Design a protein around this ligand. Sequence first.
Ligand SMILES: O=C(O)CCC(=O)C(=O)O
Ligand SMILES: [Fe+2]
Ligand SMILES: [Zn+2]
Length: 442
Amino acid sequence: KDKLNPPTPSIYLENKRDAFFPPLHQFCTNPKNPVTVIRGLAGALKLDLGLFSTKTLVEANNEHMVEVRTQLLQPADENWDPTGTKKIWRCESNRSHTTIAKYAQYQASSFQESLREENEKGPFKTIKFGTNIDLSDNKKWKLQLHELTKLPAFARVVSAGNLLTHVGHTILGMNTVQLYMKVPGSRTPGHQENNNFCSVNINIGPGDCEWFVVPEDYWGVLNDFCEKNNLNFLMSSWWPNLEDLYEANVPVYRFIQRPGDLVWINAGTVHWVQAVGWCNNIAWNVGPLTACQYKLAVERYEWNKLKSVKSPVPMVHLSWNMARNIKVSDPKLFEMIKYCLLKILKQYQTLREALVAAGKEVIWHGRTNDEPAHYCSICEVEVFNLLFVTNESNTQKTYIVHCHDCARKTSKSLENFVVLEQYKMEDLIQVYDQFTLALSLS
Ligand SMILES: O=C(O)CCC(=O)C(=O)O
Ligand SMILES: [Fe+2]
Ligand SMILES: [Zn+2]
């Protein structure tokens, strides 16, 4: 069907008024729109994209680290096995590091070489893609990060309506900006965002990017394809074969992102991207306060546990911060958070009572203001409140955190561990009891 090649939801902006118009925010966060392309966004806000040009970046922090992916330059929208015999999902994406200065040299020489060639199945050429460049440090990137505060609030890296702001600590590349330096064919293979959070991406130019998008509710189909092909959906590099998707009745949105266009990837939307020209991009995540965002983040948090993959977003910590600090006025979102908090509380009460009944001391440890969430040093599951720390790490005050299961596996009666408690039961109960639905007429 042509239902399988649907039009891209698109907003055409001319000025600041259009950027700040509330129906824009509502359109982006509507779960029926898997992606929204906001055309002309940089022009409409007079955003200086020159602050993100390769020349500017080299002048600012020439030795800054760049993760390099070395990839094959594949034709059009296809991915061929290295022999050029058949189309397959697995893609070659070998990893190394470089600096902004060194990648910039390659990006520029790549272009000059193409000019020279223009003045003249595979085998394919190799290219390098500069990815995951960390723009978190405000003392290194002051002017760059300041420019992004010109965005409307809903798309900012930091805002009161962004769940990632309510985490209360840094999650690199999610509530901090990542930069991408590209040459033609540079590919970001198929993925959903970490914990299914929305993503914001602005193309710096001067070249274009081509995007491929599949709605969230088809992700199981793509997971199945990965498994049938010996690939890990979450952890492997794959580039979908569009003919497979079409055969499976999976709709694919496909579009070009020009310099100054902002791409809003909605919660859980599956996507893969390739540079058509030479360009840089910037991106980060946002978490709208909607039932849909929270539900999908929780779902992926739980799926990640089943797949033994770390969740970058500590959904337990976050849920407590929401209850402590956010007046929630949507009944559906409210009931979800409340439901999660009750599960957390009851599991905590069950575990704490079992420890005490076995005669294990629970040590009052408290918490430093703004301390990040903890994850198990062995299995990387989030660990909330009750921390299992070895007698030796306790003595040394390194406080190396384990979950209960990992501690028990090591030490059958927890004889090798102390149990540290960061929050009093009565204090968590009060937060839960006082978390009630606020009235909004909106
Ligand atoms: O620009 C890229 O290659 C990264 C795109 C992406 O995955 C995102 O913005 O979420
Ligand atoms: Fe992405
Ligand atoms: Zn563990």
